[PDB]
Write a protein that binds this ligand. Sequence first.
Ligand SMILES: Nc1ncnc2c1ncn2[C@@H]1O[C@H](COP(=O)(O)O)[C@@H](O)[C@H]1O
Ligand SMILES: Nc1ncnc2c1ncn2[C@@H]1O[C@H](COP(=O)(O)O)[C@@H](O)[C@H]1O
Ligand code: MOO
Ligand code: MOO
Ligand SMILES: [Mg+2]
Ligand SMILES: [Mg+2]
Lengths: 422, 422
Amino acid sequence: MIPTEEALRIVFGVSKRLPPVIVSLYEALGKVLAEDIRAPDPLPPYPASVKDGYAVVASDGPGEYPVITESRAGNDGLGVTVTPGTVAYVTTGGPIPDGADAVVQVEDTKVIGDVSTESKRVKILIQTKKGTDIRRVGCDIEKDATVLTTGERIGASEIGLLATAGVTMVKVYPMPIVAILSTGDELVEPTAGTLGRGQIRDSNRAMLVAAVMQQQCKVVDLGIVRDDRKELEKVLDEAVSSGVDIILTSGGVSMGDRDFVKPLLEEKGKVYFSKVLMKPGKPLTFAEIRAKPGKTVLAFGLPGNPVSCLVCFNIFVVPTIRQLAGWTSPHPLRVRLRLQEPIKSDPIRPEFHRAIIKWKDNDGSGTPGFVAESTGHQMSSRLLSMRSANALLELPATGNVLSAGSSVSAIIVSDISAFSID
Amino acid sequence: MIPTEEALRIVFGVSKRLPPVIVSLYEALGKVLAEDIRAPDPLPPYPASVKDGYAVVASDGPGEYPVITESRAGNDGLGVTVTPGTVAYVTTGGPIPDGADAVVQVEDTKVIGDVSTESKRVKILIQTKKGTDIRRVGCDIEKDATVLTTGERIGASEIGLLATAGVTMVKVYPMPIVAILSTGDELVEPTAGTLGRGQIRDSNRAMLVAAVMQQQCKVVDLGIVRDDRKELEKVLDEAVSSGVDIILTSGGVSMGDRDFVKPLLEEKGKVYFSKVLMKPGKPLTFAEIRAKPGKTVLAFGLPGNPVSCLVCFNIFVVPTIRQLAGWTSPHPLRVRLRLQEPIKSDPIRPEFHRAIIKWKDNDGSGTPGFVAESTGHQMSSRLLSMRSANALLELPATGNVLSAGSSVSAIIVSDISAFSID
Ligand SMILES: Nc1ncnc2c1ncn2[C@@H]1O[C@H](COP(=O)(O)O)[C@@H](O)[C@H]1O
Ligand SMILES: Nc1ncnc2c1ncn2[C@@H]1O[C@H](COP(=O)(O)O)[C@@H](O)[C@H]1O
Ligand code: MOO
Ligand code: MOO
Ligand SMILES: [Mg+2]
Ligand SMILES: [Mg+2]
């Protein structure tokens, strides 16, 4: 039995970043960059107007002037020089014609004379300064500037920067492919209606398929496997040979006489641990299998108890997926929060207590902060204790009652940007 | 020009939850439940062992006893009664045979005699209590108990609860379908290499496609549209008739003489506003179009400036997607944080200043909390100001320099569970 911090250190030490691949721009979203990106041209590549109005010679000052060209895009005004005593109409993003050194926004101007006559004239109502409302070449992005670097995760703004730079095929770290199976003679498919004696619906498999889909990985669903050593070996050898990077099993890892996951993983590879000092998730097995040519497969013999299964996925499998996906910060967000109710900590095993947390203007102490409500009874067989739980409170093994208003460390396990407000 | 709080109130008031649909279990992930879910049978549906060991009569106490059956799943031990003076082998999740009222874990037992002889005997090493290590029928979930309710978002634990309850087809609120187009004679596709005079790559479209994909919505990519009124009307009528729920355009909404988005939206529907008091995102247009039979289409005439485009998406479009998707808490997470450097606020427009935020053990004041670093120059044409930005600091329009260490409100715009730790 090892502490969770040691089990996390071992998993991290064995887990290796996947070889990079080339993907399309839309396939690059969510992925970590495996190359630096440089701008091939400046942004803007031409002097551009910040406003809809008139490009002027600043030194001319307020007065009435003829409009000698109109510049909105492309070759508009090419070969036209705005000389002292003239102006050019411009729209935002329009190229500044040669000779103009400032832009006066349309609100500080007035058109003079009849619009029907070909010759347009405008009254500039202010005294402007050279450079006003013009984006010089390269002011937003300089040519050859690094706009994105290796190790940076691609979100919407990063896709926008790749498009700005003309990069539609991107070198990234891929997501791992994950195989998932359930174990047990007592299991039936979740499509089962009336259950026969001693049967339960397989809930862990669909739960883990959903959890892995939330981490943006491809899933290989290997179904229900019975408590038969040859059958489980065949399905594990099949998963190892299929090209997946991670295998997730649940159940068949406790002290039962037909719990074959641990001895099969010892036979096929290297088991680093099979027991962890934690509440819930004690029978967790982690192993490294080498697939014959030629790559490493990580195997997590997750516990059968639904709560223990999901907590072990959240604490150990999520950072492993991220490490394989090239994240430099794979660890989960940890915050500090105040308890909204008293919670009794366990006397021997530190607890990952499920909570529903929210940000409050007053956390109970006068200042703003996160607050936590327990999900109730914490039994490892009670999947209702994971319902709506967006955090795991880290309760040390003291045996004391932590009173309402006391502060604890909490691992956030679900999208902080999808947190329901107070 | 209206304040952002009024623009958000108007958008919320017009936006209506989409009609619910029936989807498969894996399609239900991320979606909000449109029906309550009740357990059709209890969990466990039979008295189940919490441990691998022996089912006993508690009153028998420590002693040596014959093992009369073995119970791991299904019909194991059916018709066998554990009477006083006998025990039954059980594995975790195994049905408790009739007559046994407690379980003694295998660690508190010892097998006696030769294993080869058919008759097995075990020594129970402790005095147990009635009910120990047995999960009674329905202790985790009672039959007909409500396990999930209308308005609850489906995450991995909720998929696990649907599978437990045998629900593989779920009534949910769907995500809206979003049409996206760019406007401008100066735009070229992001596949363009060398740019001609007065051209830029279309970056907003791929950025908004990525942003909408992160919100789990289907995208209808309508491409680049030129600054031609008939062309833009045709593409808008096409989007309205196609069945999308939201149209996103960018550009063609400022004061230019070929900015046709506003007048086209006024003609096709009801424009609620076209100008907002905010830095960045001032030219935002919001309109409601009625598609002929027969449904409502929401249209956001987003600003062309890349920063303004993404900030307006993050503040106004993200809660609208969530409201249409049936979220009861569509608003973004707002927290309070301390500035890591000084920031000058604008004297007239309140600013959505881009920041990279992280949780620190000491936020600078001695206690733990969020801290923010600015992304630098905040110009609306500078997409590099959105790079890695996971929050928008809400700076009031005071004109004062907010010093390092002062606290501000911040909107979190990207997965809090994907936050890089300190
Ligand atoms: N799709 C786009 N990608 C990048 N920049 C754009 C896009 N559309 C408009 N812009 C720029 O945003 C600014 C305002 O656009 P508009 O509202 O059309 O005048 C101008 O500088 C445009 O060149
Ligand atoms: N796929 C599953 N879905 C729900 N419960 C399970 C699953 N697999 C195992 N269990 C339960 O978890 C507990 C421990 O399983 P095991 O480690 O196989 O003894 C037992 O009560 C099992 O019935
Ligand atoms: O042995 Mo556990 O910690 O109830 O899965
Ligand atoms: O007019 Mo803006 O607020 O630079 O898009
Ligand atoms: Mg089992
Ligand atoms: Mg334009």
